[PDB]
Amino acid sequence: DAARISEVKAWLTSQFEAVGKEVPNFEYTHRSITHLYNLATASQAKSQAATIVANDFRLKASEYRAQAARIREILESAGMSQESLPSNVVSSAQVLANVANLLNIRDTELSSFLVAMGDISLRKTGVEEKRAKAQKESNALLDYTRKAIQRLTYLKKILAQLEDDVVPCESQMENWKTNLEVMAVKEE
């Protein structure tokens, strides 16, 4: 907790409205302080991760712009096609790569075909089957929970009385030990 009070005091300068959030936690945290510190540590890591990533992409964007205008000479180096440019080259080059352009076409010089089918499938085909096969157990875990849940209710159906019956059981038995000495004298 001594770690959270340190960094929260830094976050506190920005969590101005969150007081209505924090104030309710301090009524319940006793069993979750460590959890929220575990949340706090990982989240604090994500922040500085976000800060680095902001710089990384921003520069990575400003330099796509430079290298972009470098290769744009492919258009003008064929400048005789300026009148027919939009109908043939822009139309095709956009209507395919436009969505893929941001994350999926940067290496079209060496992996255009490679990514679109192989690598793109390598992700989707990698994740879909593994989850689906993982879902075959998981939906059996729904089964294993479903049977388990009814086992609990079916089990508690008998413990619905057995857990209550012990108090009757203790009283309906211990009376005998009081008389046992009077019993122990009749065996003669």
């Binding site: 890591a45 991760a49 990533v53 990384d56 470098r70 940067r106 060496l110 690598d119 990698g126 089957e129």
Partner: protein, 244 residues
């Protein structure tokens, strides 16, 4: 009846492996083919630079041809007229030639393998200047120039890290690498967070298994020895009555 349903399982349970198995064996072969072309399409690149710069040298040859044709033209007639204070400036200009001499020889010796190695940032001049891209080489270019790091040690500093993240490259071999550059460090945290999920349940589940294989065995063991004893005792409880 039972066999008919079993057959309905049979048709499923003979192809089921065949689909994944044929797919996944190809999956690994596909992966190689991607990289196994990358290093050779790279050869095109490293080859391309050879073409580019040498083409520039062809241009330079034509250019210096165009700096010598007139230059070598203009001297002769003045030389011929004399062959057939201002002396000092010529003389110190002669000293200029003496250094020019060897430094025209380098005009050729520039392309000694030394420049063949200087070609690494040179042909793509935008990648050259340290005071312009010495951080950019390690952000924008690293994803690109990675494989030559095994030969060109300078890039290795950005490659070996990836070469140890080679599982990360396998899942993003060509273009997806540039985005995990940001996301991966969180992904490991998320995986760390996931194993912490095992921690958040093992923290008290271990005690359960620890608790039970002790507590359970007591009950198992004690009940056994109890049962094997009282078993021989219930029968006597009838022996007391059979005559009575």
């Amino acid at each position: 009846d039972r066999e008919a349903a079993l057959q309905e399982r049979e048709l499923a349970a003979k192809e089921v492996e065949r689909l994944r198995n044929i797919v996944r064996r190809q999956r690994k072969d596909l992966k190689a083919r991607m990289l196994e072309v990358s290093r050779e399409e790279a050869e095109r690149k490293r080859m391309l630079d050879e073409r580019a710069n040498y083409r520039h040298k062809q241009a330079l040859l034509e250019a210096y041809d165009q700096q010598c044709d007139e230059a070598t033209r203009i001297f002769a007639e003045y030389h011929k007229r004399l062959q057939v204070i201002p002396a000092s400036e010529v003389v110190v200009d002669i000293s200029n030639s003496a250094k020019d001499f060897i430094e025209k020889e380098v005009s050729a010796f520039f392309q000694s393998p030394d420049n063949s190695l200087y070609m690494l940032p040179a042909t793509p001049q935008g990648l050259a200047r340290d005071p312009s891209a010495i951080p950019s080489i390690c952000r924008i270019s690293a994803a690109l120039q990675y494989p030559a790091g095994l030969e060109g040690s300078d890039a290795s500093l950005a490659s070996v890290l990836e070469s140890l993240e080679f599982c990360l490259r396998v899942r993003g071999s060509e273009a997806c690498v540039l985005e995990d550059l940001a996301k991966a460090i969180d992904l490991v945290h998320i995986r760390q967070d996931l194993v912490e999920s095992g921690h958040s349940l093992l923290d008290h589940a271990f005690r359960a298994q620890q608790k039970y294989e002790r507590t359970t065995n007591y009950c198992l063991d004690l009940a056994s020895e109890q049962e094997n004893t009282i078993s021989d005792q219930w029968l006597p409880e009838l022996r007391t009555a059979v005559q009575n």
